Design an enzyme around this catalytic site. Structure first.
Site, PDB file in Angstrom:
ATOM      1  N   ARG A  10      54.264  63.871  32.975  1.00 26.50           N
ATOM      2  CA  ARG A  10      55.707  64.039  33.019  1.00 26.50           C
ATOM      3  C   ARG A  10      56.010  65.241  33.898  1.00 26.50           C
ATOM      4  O   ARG A  10      55.119  66.051  34.170  1.00 26.50           O
ATOM      5  CB  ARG A  10      56.262  64.223  31.605  1.00 26.50           C
ATOM      6  CG  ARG A  10      57.761  64.478  31.496  1.00 26.50           C
ATOM      7  CD  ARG A  10      58.585  63.337  32.060  1.00 26.50           C
ATOM      8  NE  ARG A  10      59.998  63.495  31.732  1.00 26.50           N
ATOM      9  CZ  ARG A  10      60.974  63.558  32.635  1.00 26.50           C
ATOM     10  NH1 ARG A  10      60.690  63.476  33.926  1.00 26.50           N
ATOM     11  NH2 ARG A  10      62.232  63.708  32.243  1.00 26.50           N
ATOM     12  N   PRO A  12      58.961  67.988  33.772  1.00 32.38           N
ATOM     13  CA  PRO A  12      59.225  69.309  33.183  1.00 32.38           C
ATOM     14  C   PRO A  12      58.491  69.571  31.883  1.00 32.38           C
ATOM     15  O   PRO A  12      58.436  70.724  31.440  1.00 32.38           O
ATOM     16  CB  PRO A  12      60.743  69.286  32.969  1.00 32.38           C
ATOM     17  CG  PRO A  12      61.049  67.851  32.743  1.00 32.38           C
ATOM     18  CD  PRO A  12      60.115  67.086  33.642  1.00 32.38           C
ATOM     19  N   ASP A  13      57.928  68.545  31.253  1.00 32.32           N
ATOM     20  CA  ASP A  13      57.391  68.700  29.905  1.00 32.32           C
ATOM     21  C   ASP A  13      56.057  69.444  29.893  1.00 32.32           C
ATOM     22  O   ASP A  13      55.949  70.528  29.314  1.00 32.32           O
ATOM     23  CB  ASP A  13      57.244  67.328  29.239  1.00 32.32           C
ATOM     24  CG  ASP A  13      57.182  67.416  27.728  1.00 32.32           C
ATOM     25  OD1 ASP A  13      56.901  68.515  27.205  1.00 32.32           O
ATOM     26  OD2 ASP A  13      57.416  66.390  27.062  1.00 32.32           O
ATOM     27  N   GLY A  43      62.257  57.468  49.982  1.00 28.28           N
ATOM     28  CA  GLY A  43      62.074  56.033  49.941  1.00 28.28           C
ATOM     29  C   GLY A  43      62.005  55.551  48.507  1.00 28.28           C
ATOM     30  O   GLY A  43      62.766  56.017  47.657  1.00 28.28           O
ATOM     31  N   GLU A  77      54.708  53.549  38.607  1.00 26.91           N
ATOM     32  CA  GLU A  77      53.440  54.009  39.155  1.00 26.91           C
ATOM     33  C   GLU A  77      52.288  53.672  38.222  1.00 26.91           C
ATOM     34  O   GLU A  77      51.213  53.276  38.679  1.00 26.91           O
ATOM     35  CB  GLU A  77      53.492  55.510  39.425  1.00 26.91           C
ATOM     36  CG  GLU A  77      52.224  56.060  40.039  1.00 26.91           C
ATOM     37  CD  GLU A  77      51.255  56.575  39.001  1.00 26.91           C
ATOM     38  OE1 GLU A  77      50.191  57.102  39.386  1.00 26.91           O
ATOM     39  OE2 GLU A  77      51.560  56.462  37.797  1.00 26.91           O
TER      40      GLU A  77
END
Length: 170
Positions: A10, A12-13, A43, A77
Site C-alpha cells: 500500500r 501511505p500505510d 498513462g 497490478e
DNA sequence: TTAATTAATTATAATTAATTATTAATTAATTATTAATTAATTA
C-alpha cells in the site's frame, strides 16, 4: 544483475511503517531487491518499469495490508502477478498478512465491502469479477500472520532466511 | 512568496427511506389429580 525479489504494498500505510526495514535488512544478505514508490499515473500501465521487472523477478512476495483494496493501481497490478504465476509454476508466492484476518481476504467482506461499494460505479461488470477471482486465490497459500503483539523485528529475520534458503540451495 | 483560471487525483462519513427476527416479560384464562396425613366407616 537482475532482480530476484519483487515487492508490492500500500502507499501511505506501510511504506515507512515496516516494509522499509525489510528492504534494508534484506540487502544485508547480498541479494538485489526491487521496491518502487513512483505513483505512475503516466498513462494506465507503464511498460519499461513495472512490466519489465515483473517478468524479471523470481519470487513475487506481496504484502497485503488493511487498505490494500482501494488503490486502483494495486489490485489490477496484483491481477498481473497471480496470472503470470499460473502459466509458469517455476516461481512461487509467499504472501504476508498484516493487521487483518486471513478471512477478510477470501471473500472481500468486512473492511473491503465499502471499497467495492464505490468501485462498481466506474469500471466494467466483468473486470471487478476478475479482481475478486485473483485476490481470492492469494488468500489460500502459506503466510505469516502478524498479530497486534508479534514482534515486528523477529518476524523479519525469520521470513528473510526463508527467502535466502531458496537461493543458496537453489 | 499571494491572487486567479484550466486540468486532473484521492476520501472516508452523515442522513433519509425500506425489507428482513424468535427471543424478552408480565398479565389474564383453561387444562394436570395425585402427594399427603387427619376424620369417619366397613372386610
Amino acid at each position: 544483475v537482475e532482480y530476484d525479489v519483487f515487492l508490492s504494498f500500500r502507499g501511505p500505510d506501510t511504506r515507512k511503517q515496516f516494509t522499509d526495514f525489510l528492504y534494508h535488512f534484506l540487502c544485508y544478505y547480498k541479494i538485489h531487491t526491487f521496491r518502487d514508490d513512483d505513483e505512475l499515473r503516466k498513462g494506465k500501465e507503464i511498460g519499461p518499469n513495472l512490466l519489465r521487472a515483473i517478468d524479471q523477478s523470481k519470487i513475487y512476495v506481496p504484502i497485503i495490508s488493511s487498505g490494500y483494496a482501494d488503490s486502483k493501481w494495486c489490485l489490477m497490478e496484483l491481477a498481473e502477478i497471480v496470472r503470470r504465476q499460473e502459466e509458469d509454476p517455476r516461481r512461487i508466492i509467499l504472501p504476508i498478512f498484516y493487521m487483518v484476518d486471513p478471512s477478510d481476504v477470501r471473500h472481500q467482506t468486512g473492511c473491503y465491502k465499502k471499497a467495492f461499494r464505490k468501485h462498481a460505479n466506474k469500471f466494467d461488470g466483468q473486470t471487478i469479477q476478475n479482481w475478486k477471482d485473483a485476490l481470492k486465490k492469494v488468500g489460500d497459500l502459506k503466510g505469516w500472520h502478524i498479530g497486534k503483539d508479534d514482534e515486528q523485528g523477529a518476524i523479519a529475520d525469520k521470513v528473510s532466511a526463508d527467502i535466502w534458503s531458496h537461493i543458496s540451495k537453489e
